[PDB]
Design an enzyme around this catalytic site. Structure first.
Site, mmCIF file in Angstrom:
data_model
loop_
_atom_site.group_PDB
_atom_site.id
_atom_site.type_symbol
_atom_site.label_atom_id
_atom_site.label_comp_id
_atom_site.label_asym_id
_atom_site.label_seq_id
_atom_site.Cartn_x
_atom_site.Cartn_y
_atom_site.Cartn_z
ATOM 1 N N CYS B 105 -11.167 -38.943 -2.992
ATOM 2 C CA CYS B 105 -9.856 -38.306 -3.187
ATOM 3 C C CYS B 105 -8.931 -38.693 -2.022
ATOM 4 O O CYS B 105 -8.564 -39.876 -1.963
ATOM 5 C CB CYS B 105 -10.011 -36.811 -3.456
ATOM 6 N N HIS B 125 -7.402 -40.887 -4.509
ATOM 7 C CA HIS B 125 -6.554 -40.210 -5.463
ATOM 8 C C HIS B 125 -5.225 -40.988 -5.571
ATOM 9 O O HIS B 125 -4.712 -41.479 -4.540
ATOM 10 C CB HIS B 125 -6.233 -38.815 -5.004
HETATM 11 C C1 LIG Z 1 -7.861 -34.469 -3.998
HETATM 12 O O1 LIG Z 1 -8.962 -33.577 -3.903
HETATM 13 C C2 LIG Z 1 -7.210 -34.667 -2.768
HETATM 14 O O2 LIG Z 1 -7.745 -34.902 -1.685
HETATM 15 N N1 LIG Z 1 -5.905 -34.686 -2.963
HETATM 16 C C3 LIG Z 1 -5.019 -34.705 -1.796
HETATM 17 C C4 LIG Z 1 -4.048 -35.861 -1.853
HETATM 18 O O3 LIG Z 1 -4.254 -36.850 -2.530
HETATM 19 O O4 LIG Z 1 -2.900 -35.658 -1.121
HETATM 20 C C5 LIG Z 1 -2.195 -36.871 -0.912
HETATM 21 C C6 LIG Z 1 -1.549 -36.657 0.436
HETATM 22 C C7 LIG Z 1 -1.913 -37.867 1.282
HETATM 23 C C8 LIG Z 1 -3.305 -37.582 1.897
HETATM 24 C C9 LIG Z 1 -5.668 -34.325 -4.240
HETATM 25 C C10 LIG Z 1 -4.506 -34.105 -4.836
HETATM 26 C C11 LIG Z 1 -4.469 -33.700 -6.155
HETATM 27 C C12 LIG Z 1 -5.644 -33.492 -6.897
HETATM 28 C C13 LIG Z 1 -6.853 -33.740 -6.220
HETATM 29 C C14 LIG Z 1 -6.835 -34.130 -4.907
#
Ligand SMILES: *[C@@]1(=O)C(=O)N([C]C(=O)O[C][C][C][C])C2=[C][C]=[C][C]=C21
Ligand SMILES: *[C@@]1(=O)C(=O)N([C]C(=O)O[C][C][C][C])C2=[C][C]=[C][C]=C21
Ligand SMILES: [Cl-]
Ligand SMILES: [Cl-]
Lengths: 187, 187
Positions: B105, B125
């Site tokens: 993610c 992600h």
């Molecule tokens: C994930 O579990 C996760 O980590 N994000 C955070 C993300 O991508 O934020 C981006 C900011 C830069 C680090 C996320 C976001 C949405 C759904 C699932 C997840």
């Protein structure tokens, strides 16, 4: 007004089946109470993940009733739920008020134990079918999620997202469920 | 001999991305340590699930090294991992010894912060792509799981089973991963 979910957390619960619905329901703007069956202390799940409940079941019951009551699986978790008089009372009340009850994996076997939702189409984990079907009180389904009115069941850890999103759809509608789903990167 | 996994658990971790790999790796017979970044106390995850770590990171590090180091996501979890000198040291050591590092993610953004695995093909992600790709130090992939040598990355909560099973396959082989997968009722 916000919908409210009671997730009953017993020793030996499957931690994936507990955490995925809690998290997904919170993403949907549902107010979720993780309620410890045994009291307020941390709960040792099936694969040794330790989760600290928001409250005891005894206390969460006072803040009832809830729009959904959720029963995770795990063999020993579901057995603890099945043996609980407190769970019996909560489920009977929920059924009588036409509130949703959702159960996954071995969790639906607690519905059998407490005589809830007889005549419903249900699914379970494949390994829990024979226990669930003892007496022929339900009709069995191999669907990954089965919703028959206010009895919503599902099969295993790998169907937990689908189960959770079905709860979300039932409470908050199709559109909210779709919005919550997209960021999760589900197939 | 049994393989060993270190899962680094920070405040704001995505609890699904923490629990699914812990549980699945334990199902695979891996010895997993859930290590609290901040110490030994319970950790408030992103959606308010509270998990009690097996140990502090400080203590788990003494029992190193590990066959895999796992970095869950969650925006604030990944930021805490990114800012940690202790995580830096652990990942540098792991990389230098040619041990597996797995991140999901926003978790892979900690690899950027700690200068780990540069030149690798990675995924994240979708929302974390721009952060991960700042400087063009990696090549980006939209695969649900990306394994490039000893850097294993994945996209979100909905890819957590696939991520976990990829770790299992890397450590214990295809056949163990298949055996662990079947009871989970995955699509
Ligand atoms: C994930 O579990 C996760 O980590 N994000 C955070 C993300 O991508 O934020 C981006 C900011 C830069 C680090 C996320 C976001 C949405 C759904 C699932 C997840
Ligand atoms: C589920 O998480 C789960 O609850 N089970 C337990 C089960 O089906 O045991 C059957 C015994 C009769 C209750 C299970 C089993 C395997 C994978 C996932 C799960
Ligand atoms: Cl179990
Ligand atoms: Cl987050």
């Amino acid at each position: 007004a916000s919908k409210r979910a009671l997730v009953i957390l017993a020793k030996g619960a499957e931690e994936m089946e507990t955490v995925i619905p809690v998290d997904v329901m919170r993403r949907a703007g549902i107010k979720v109470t993780v309620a410890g069956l045994a009291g307020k202390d941390p709960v040792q799940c099936s694969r040794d993940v330790v989760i600290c409940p928001d409250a005891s079941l005894e206390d969460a019951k006072k803040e009832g009733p809830y729009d959904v009551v959720v029963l995770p699986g795990g063999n020993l978790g579901a057995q603890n739920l099945s043996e609980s008089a407190a769970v019996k009372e909560i489920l009977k009340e929920q059924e009588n008020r036409k509130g949703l009850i959702a159960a996954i994996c071995a969790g639906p076997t607690a519905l059998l134990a407490h005589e809830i939702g007889f005549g419903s189409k249900v699914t379970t984990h494949p390994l829990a079918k024979d226990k669930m079907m003892n007496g022929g009180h339900y009709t069995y389904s191999e669907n990954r999620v089965e919703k028959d009115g206010l009895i919503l069941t599902s099969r295993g850890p790998g169907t937990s997202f689908e189960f959770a999103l079905a709860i979300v759809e039932a409470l908050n509608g199709k559109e909210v469920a779709a919005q919550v789903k997209a960021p999760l990167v589900l197939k």
